[model samples]
Target: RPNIIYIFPDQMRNSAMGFWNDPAFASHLQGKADPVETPNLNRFARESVVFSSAMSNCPLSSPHRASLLTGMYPHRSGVPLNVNSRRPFSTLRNDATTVSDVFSRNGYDCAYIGKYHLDTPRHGFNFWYSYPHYWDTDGKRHDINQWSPSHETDMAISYLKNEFGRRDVSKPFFLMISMNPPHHPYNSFNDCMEEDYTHYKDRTLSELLVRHNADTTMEKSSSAAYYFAQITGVDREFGRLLEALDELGLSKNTMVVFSSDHGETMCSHGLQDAKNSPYIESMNVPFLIRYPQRLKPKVVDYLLSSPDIMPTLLGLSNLGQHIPHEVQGTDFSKALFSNQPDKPLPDAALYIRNMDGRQKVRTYVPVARGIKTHRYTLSLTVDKENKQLKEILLFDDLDDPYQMNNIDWNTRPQLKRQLLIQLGQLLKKYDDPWYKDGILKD
Candidate 1:
């Protein structure tokens, strides 16, 4: 009987917020924190339960989102790559019933607003407004501009206001407002080259250099500052949404879940975009829950992902429903309510995949899959020509936290064996006909 508002920010890293070990993005350590500050988010985290290690299933937009909506893997959803056009036989299919559909069928008014990258016609949501993709021909050619969420926020507010005015207190409602900011187009206005870069450039790289113990010679401070500005803008929009929620008097009975699709990497780990990389910066996202009555305000430092979102939301609403469809994500409701000091959460290996564009459009990169657990991250890809699994690179995150030096796994037989076993377990569950067909049939 509770209304649900799921607010998702694009490419928001866990490090961006002040509440979660993110002093850099928090204090605006450089000139990057201007025009956008997330004071409201900090306050919301204090009042709500927070998930520290919430990761995305895939780093890219379409695949990750498909996984989130359908409660299945990206490969299962048939949209593995963003830019790649699906083959004639291949299509994106939503064979499984979505969580939103369940809410709607059960008599809740479902509203979805903001970026919807999936190519399928809108389903489940009674009211929906979104941008299917970014307009690349815009200012600075950035992701933020391409998938701006400010206008969408305006529409959502109007809808919420109307809903409040004509309240049917007898029935609860379900609303999802997805916003895109701080994801890409790191710089604002697309002009201030000198001033913006100088302020944010060094400060952003300085933190990364220190953490990874790497040289800061090729640091692009301007780019860093630009990224920070995008994040700040997102924070401001979130504040506005929260304020509206408070005015509408829905903050008490409504449980607000704030998170992101994935995180962005500012030239960390020799990767810039979040789409392909399995690095922590690309996969780690902001996940905050504010349900004062059912949950306490504390950080749950366990590994969670987009798959876990559905069950958690249902549980928060007191629906007493288990995961309705087949999904890779597990329900973490027990962990949210548990009082144990050091309870071990479910330890499962993560899976990620990417598709390549045709040569005429873009060269395709071979599929890279990896296994990520609490301790290590091991990734490998088979050579296309020879069809052989290449040598795996292993990083001892606990010892070399920045993953700087690759340990000689051949010498460390025990560690290598353990990681290989982990990889085997993940591959065992990797069967999805959708990935092979490249079609998402509804």
Candidate 2:
């Protein structure tokens, strides 16, 4: 089997890449995209299977990360909300069958570097170098003068070189690196490296804030520069990692994935919240996978979800037999290679919104559920106490490309009904809490 390296940044929006500005990929975006420079990722897109519609369902750090690892929904994975010590139930379940467990079981050396937010002792990993959660060193320095992502790159490179004799050289390895930059504190130079901020400080808001729904008049609009600066900084750091892989002669045989846990809103719709919403800015994340020997490089429109990441990776690594039946995610590894047109793709991906609270045995409350199809998004928000529908929001992303207009749900009964049925089908398919309890009836 091939070696695997998955690098997921904290909060990188799909449109933040410079490659979107390219003529070939421009049509994927609704309108003007974020003005950012990611030269490394631009070249990477051409060498990888890039998905234009990969979404982070539930779009919060802990929930989505749990889903990514366990190949299950947030509730099933035991992380309904962001991990909080005050709420211990929102951590990765000890009994959860994770990708690392499968890989380790199959004789692969598993190593996890940076940001282990599962909030439990490292489970199946053979080598571990990760901090707990944001609060692990929140408000205080995490040591060293270098930026987080840059330092993370150094740690990953050292592991690759077996600097500390970390892993068995004879065995295939699965490595995951999580960087925390391009997430928050994008207020000034103190948040990011001065070199990165220098590149964007001179640019005007008209250039920096290009998304159609972005309101530059808002006070937080200026943060776009710092946010993008961290992106460019991450890009450079990512480039170094790729270079190291090449220098070590591991590029061709290694499967490399570049993505993010969620995306930053950056004043979109006049909101400061970065995630945990059905909005495109929060749910849509960049997903790029590259494997030179086994898979061809091309762009696909498949609606990739967070849960599917685990099973697909296991399949790609020739560990399909190890993909336990407990996994609720589908294995779409067949789609990565060309000439697999017979492979059926998902019609839509589920959207989950969870809040911290108590609900039966679950510690978090599932407040909203929805689905994002190719051209539309329908969300059904429910009251926590009664679990009854309180608000219905439908967006025609094809017509109102920026999602600026919300179609009147009352006027579109048939469409709403059809979407509800589809959403119910997805919920049942994943065994989501909404389906198991009949909370969202069609």
Candidate 3:
């Protein structure tokens, strides 16, 4: 069996990649979908499968990371939000078994470096290197330099070269490098480049803004440039990993994956914010995988999620045992090797636990939840009158993929009913517990 190396960027949006079908990203960098060339990723996409409609059920960091590691959603795993303020084991339930543990049980040498934010120690990893909690150094709590990708890249390279030094060469290995960038502090580089906001004053901004309805006065163009630069930097480091694989003569046997936890809003919508919403930009992500000689190259437009990563990797390695019947995902091995185009991906649903306490009092809001389908987004807020905790529906995706417009209560009542039913099905299937216990009582 070959080694596995999975690379994940922090909050890179799906549209940011040239390979995906997004006109805005194409138009932004002059009709070119790719503002920066990612030769390794391009090659990986060709040989491996690309899930065009892949999504991160929750756009927040810790919640989604928990899902990826445990094959369970936030509510199910009891990881309410980021564990920045809580101990590593405080937020996560003790029952969770991470992917690393699964691989470890099967005899693979598992290693992880960078951005281990779960509220528990990595259960199965033999080697772990991560920063202090996200909130420790920066009390302001913006993504800026709070999470750096280059340092992560350096650590990953060292791990590959030294930590697993002179391995038996026959035993399989699982190595994951997680980088948090393209997230926020939107203008860390710009704040250092120019002392004023004069450069990006023309665009509309959201997410990190002071007000929800405020428009055009505060733009994030400068920050967008910085975000782009960060992604490009990550891409370059990814290239290095590939080079290392080839240099070590492990390229043929190794399976490589490149993806992100979620995407950022590089002004795709009027709101140029990062994750923490139900917009396409926030939920969708780039999912590229490569396993040479075993799976054929193809672009599968199937819908997938973070919870699927573990099962899929295990299947590709021929390491699957009795799969947990309760897990919410399935392996895409057959679809990956199929010659014909697969069926249109299923419509996906997402949920986000509000992080009101993360921000300052000037921009605080209450707990909220959001639901999204292939064509619509509905946000249900707890504070109804303030429209802070409210359900907003966006039906016209072609015109408002960012979900800027709300057609709640006005959209076809039948469509709303169908979506609500589908949402219930997903919630039940995942054993979300919130619904099972009447937390989301209607």
Candidate 4:
């Protein structure tokens, strides 16, 4: 059994990293975009198999996290929206079996550290040290240490050091380190650690303004700089974790995975400080997995989502048989391990869903359903009351990589028909109410 370390950061997008997807903005470009230095991630990507087209099932924090953990759709996992005081569904159902639960049952000592926004009584981990320390209300509010990613990294390192001797050496371990940074408060000079802001203090805002297509002013550009700085800060601490792994002689046997709950809009497409939208900036995320013993380094364009993670990880671990029956995710381990360029892999068809009361900005999206494929993205927006089709959008990602140009229905009738049929099939498979009468009802 191999040890696994899953590092997930909140609101970090696919474009934020130095490597991964084909980023839209030149400033946010992958694999060496200036003003954003993620050397640790770039090095990790060279050793790891990078998923270029990974996305969140629901572009919201809690929903995607729930889908990632349970291998279920957001609705199935009972967390279709961001949990808050006003929301009806605030937390993941206690009965939902998480991927961590399966590992714990299989003799792995699981430790979960850092921001756990899934509500109290976190399940499935043998050791848990959540950030924004939940025990005391006053501490939770004013705990600057809890809010800092550096402090979170220190806690993770401490856990690894202490547990080295305390845990069962015979059994493998699963550690999840989740951080909340590179997310918000883009003016880190005022809100974040000083080191995180120092790098961007002298940086000019002119280049960032040119890169962002959205309507902006000095405020947004400065925010973008701070956002980039926060990412660098996270990268610095990530380097520390990797060094510790190497020093401890645990790097070879451990599967180090890096991902994020969802993507941040960051003034892209004229959206300001938001996610939970169907836009690519809000959905696309970075997903990197490194386990030298079993996997090789390569970039995969396969369209993957949160639900697919649990099954794929299990398959890579040679524990496919243990994957839960309730898991709706497909096992794409073959694509990850296959050396043949033409090896037959299943066509990627990812299901997308969202609910009302999820985000403060886009309060409701009219019960939309969409499918993202390699070449195109087709979505059907429906009316909530009558469940009637509101609009059909089809974008040729190759031609309009930024998704600015929406292909008219008449321009590509055959392609539209084909994609709509495919989308219908997916909805049917998921038993969505939108599919009816052998077609999309709404």
Candidate 5:
């Protein structure tokens, strides 16, 4: 048995990595130009297996988190939109099976530390140190004494040092540390003692705005700099955790997985500070797995989604048999660990955006459903009342990675039909309510 350490951050873009697809964008910069340093992640990518085309099943936090944990789509997991005061769909159904439940039943001491926005602990875990309530101070402050990220890291370190040794060493452990940095309020850098602000300190608003293809007159440069600074700060703390594992001699036997729930637009597409959109910047996320014992270091371009994580981890750990039958993800562990080149796991990856009524309206209505393939992203927007098709968008990712052009039904009729059939079949398989009469309907 092997120990598993999963570090899941919030709102981190897939391109924020220091190593991955497009050697140009791999080294800590926005659009491969603006400077953002992630040295620890850069080193981790070297030692780990990276997934360059990983995407979120849903772009919102609660929905993506639910899907990631249960290996199910957002609707299947009972979390279709953001969970907040106005939209109260945050709870994971008690009947739903989580990866932690399976791991715990198999004699692993499962521990969950950090942001748990699911509202309850229905998911099985031996030790739980959750967000806001578990922190020593207010989660919003930047002071080291009050900042949640630093406090969470401290608690994680303490658990690794004290509680881990006290536990039964015969059984392997599964620990999940969820951090809430690089999410928002980028100004938290003022409180980050472990990080220096020099990397993005002098960046002007124009340089930062230019990366997102936004107007230079935008006043978000200072906030954007802090956002990048926050990620670097989190990276430093991540380095600390890795050092602890090495000190405890758990590095070789433990599998370290790093990823995010979703991504941030950061003013991309003129949707300033918005997510839950069908854009790649909001849908794609970084995924890395470092397990030297049974896996090799390589970059996998397969289309991986949030639901696929549980089954993949189970396969890699040789615990595939314990995976619940309800899991909707396919295991790609063989492709990852083997010497052969990786193949596409699915014809396309499904994405959904169901907004809570409480969320503030943005510039344009969001697409209801979409599918991302190796080179294209196709989506459909439907009217809320009657569920009739309102708009369709098709972006050639290879030609326009920034998604500046939209070639809908007229430009690629054959491709559109093929993708529509694929998307319809997927919707039917998943028991989505939108599938009807061999196409997407209300």
Candidate 6:
């Protein structure tokens, strides 16, 4: 098995990449790309397979993390909402057979660093240094004054170098890094480096937020520079990791992926909430894979769902047969490596929104379900009290790229029926609890 490094920062959107402005990748965006400085990521796109249609199905932090590890939907992964001290039972299963389980079982030394939101045990990782509060491999907590992404990147580079007998050098390694910045606290230099903020601080709000949907009048509008600054900083830190790989002669056979849990809304639709929405700004995520020995640099509009990550990664590593039986994600590695990478791939990806059942709600219950197809996005939200459908959001992604207009589902009966059929299929395929509900009966 080859070495694998998966680096996904918290709340970084797909559009934030500077390469989207390039003609090769520009046409893929359904809306205008953010005018941000990400020079290193631009270079990464030149050498990797970039996915423009990858979606964070549930979009919240904990749910997406749980789904990514277990290759299951949030409902099935035992986490339908973000995990915290307030939520006692909403977390990943302790004994979950994660992607790490297979890698660790088959001679790979696994390492995990940075933001781990799950309350359960860090599954299968031999070397763990995770935080909102850093925990070292010794199973004790440690603190660092440096920025989280930068510090985590330092630790990641250390793992790559195998510092101080951290691992058996003879064995292949798997490193999963999660950076916290560019997620929140993006209002001041206190949240990011002055070197990063210097790049965007001079830019006016209108200049930083170039997207058509952004509402510049809002209070959150001014936070764009710092958010973009953090992104650029993450870009630099990621570049350093790539540099270490090249310097260590590990670039050829190693597999590296860059993505995020979800995305920042940033007043895109005049909405305050950052994640857990069906809108593209909140759900669309960056998915880039670079395996110099195996994959060619190209762009593909594959409708990759959140759960599809684990299986695809395993399949690409020649470990597809070892993927757990409980995994619901599709193994698209064959399609990815084939001459026809576009064929035999998903035509639509599922969309989900889970919340409290209250009106005394305890567990996070499914309230909205929909699908993002090749050209459209449809979501049906129900009243939590009655569990009866209420809002039907339909966007013609090709026409209303920023998703400004919600086409009436009742008027477009044929298209509505078509989209619902696809949504139902996704629910059934993933064993989404929505499949057993009566809402889709119309």
All candidates' TM-scores?
A: 0.80, 0.94, 0.77, 0.87, 0.89, 0.96
Clashing pairs for predicted structure model 4, backbone only: 18-31
Residue runs of model 2 more than 4 Å from their true location after superposition? 132-142, 182-186, 358-362
For residue 317, what is the lDDT in candidate 4?
A: 75
For 1-442, candidate 4 gives per-residue lDDT tens digits of: 8888888887787777765432422322222233466879878888888877787868877878788888877656767667665565557888877888888888888887776677522566876666634222123333554446777787678766665454565778888888766344454455555766676676666554333334455356557766777777788888899999988868899898899988766766677656676666677788889988989887777778888888887777777788989888877876677775554453545546556644433333327778887777777666655567777777776666667777787787798777877777666665554543333452
C-alpha lDDT (0 to 100) for residue 108 of candidate 2? 86
User: What is candidate 1's CA lDDT for residue 409?
Assistant: 77
At residue 108, what lDDT does model 1 achieve?
84
Error of 4 at 6 (Å): 0.5
Off by over 4 Å in 6: 182-186, 341-344, 358-361
Between candidates 3 and 6, the one scoring higher on lDDT is 6
What is the C-alpha lDDT profile of model 1 across 1-442, one tens digit per residue? 7788888877676666655445522331211222223567877878887776677767777666766766666656655666334332123465666668777777787778776657633556766565524322121222343335566676667767875443344567777777765324344545333322343444545653333532345434335556655565566677788889889877787788888887765555645343556666667677888875778887765677666777667666665374575666566776676676445465645656655545343333335666767777676655544435665657775565556667777888898788766666555555533234321221
Q: Number of backbone collisions per candidate, in order?
A: 14, 0, 10, 1, 1, 1
Model 5 misplaced regions, further than 4 Å? 20-34, 120-122, 135-144, 163-166, 182-194, 209-212, 340-344, 356-367, 436-442
Question: What tens digits encode model 5's per-residue C-alpha lDDT throughout 1-442?
Answer: 9999899878888766545434733532224433557788888988888887888968878888888788898777877766554555556777888998888888887878777777532365766776735632223323344566667777777777766453466778888888876334444455444444677776777655444444455455446777667777777778888988888878999999999988877767767667787788788888889998898887777789888999898888888888899899878887787775656458788888765433443212223888888788888877765567888878888777778888856667798778878888778787765653333442
Off by over 4 Å in 4: 20-35, 132-147, 163-166, 182-188, 209-212, 340-346, 351-353, 357-366, 436-442
What is the clash count of model 6?
A: 1
Which order, best to worst by TM-score? 6, 2, 5, 4, 1, 3
User: Candidate 3, residues 172-268: lDDT per residue as tens digits?
Assistant: 8898888765343453553222212223334433322221232334356446545555666667678878887777777888888888887665555
